[PDB]
Ligand binder design. Structure first.
Ligand SMILES: C[C@@H]1[C@H]([C@H](C(=O)O)[C@@H](C)O)N=C(C(=O)O)[C@H]1S[C@@H]1CN[C@H](C(=O)N(C)C)C1
Ligand SMILES: [Zn+2]
Ligand SMILES: [Zn+2]
Length: 219
């Protein structure tokens, strides 16, 4: 791929989009979202981190002859909801919870076109399920479950195994994060792949590892 956007196949219908941003002192580092393909229809889980990443993603999807039906953003930060304004211009439906829209509005950013007003939401009929586990990385963070592939998109609610801390905690509830994670652990014992917002894909250990990081940071 390019220095802005890499795509990695996770299964027949599911791609991981990895978008890059310069964050000193690490150089270029990736944010992960998904593309889910349902027949002639494509769906974005999180927007890429840069507007350029997003335009390259739209081109790569539309170059397969797929219509981008919808996008769901997993929290109010730029590495998940950064290109809500572009998608809304292109008349691609954006989905965000009422909590995500509250925090976008509070930070003077455009809200989603469509509001999720439930703790569980069927983002793509029989293909993608949204769950709100409670506060963790942010008040508003959600996870996305792909029942056909047994893929859980954790976003920034979930840390990579290698990560030894929680990253940016300025909007975090470190006290609730372990109880929130226990809900996700209890809901998805069948998860084969967990996608963190940053770093390597893994198994359920990533859930238990994030819970442990959070339990220790309270000390
Ligand atoms: C500041 C970041 C980024 C921010 C965030 O989502 O809080 C984003 C808004 O810039 N996501 C974050 C997080 O805490 O999850 C942080 S860490 C970032 C992603 N992985 C890299 C990392 O921590 N490495 C060890 C390479 C840098
Ligand atoms: Zn974040
Ligand atoms: Zn992040």
């Amino acid at each position: 791929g390019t220095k802005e956007l890499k795509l990695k196949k996770l299964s027949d219908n599911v791609y991981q989009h990895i978008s890059y941003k310069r964050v000193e002192p690490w150089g270029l580092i990736g944010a992960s979202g998904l593309v889910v393909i349902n027949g002639t229809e494509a769906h974005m889980i999180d927007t890429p981190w840069t507007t350029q990443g997003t335009k390259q993603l739209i081109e790569w999807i539309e170059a397969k002859g797929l219509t981008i039906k919808s996008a769901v953003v997993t929290h109010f930060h730029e590495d998940a909801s950064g290109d809500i304004p572009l998608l809304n211009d292109l008349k691609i439906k954006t989905y965000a919870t009422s909590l995500t829209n509250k925090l976008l509005k509070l930070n003077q950013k455009e809200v989603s076109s469509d509001e999720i007003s439930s703790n569980t939401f069927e983002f793509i009929d029989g293909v993608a399920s949204v769950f709100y586990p409670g506060a963790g990385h942010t008040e508003d963070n959600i996870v996305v479950w792909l029942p056909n592939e047994k893929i859980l998109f954790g976003g920034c609610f979930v840390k990579s195994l290698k990560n030894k801390n929680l990253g940016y905690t300025g909007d975090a509830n470190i006290s609730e994060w372990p109880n929130s994670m226990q809900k996700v652990i209890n809901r998805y014992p069948d998860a084969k792949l967990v996608v963190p917002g940053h770093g390597e894909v893994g198994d359920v250990s990533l859930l238990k590892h994030t819970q442990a990081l959070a339990l220790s940071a309270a000390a």
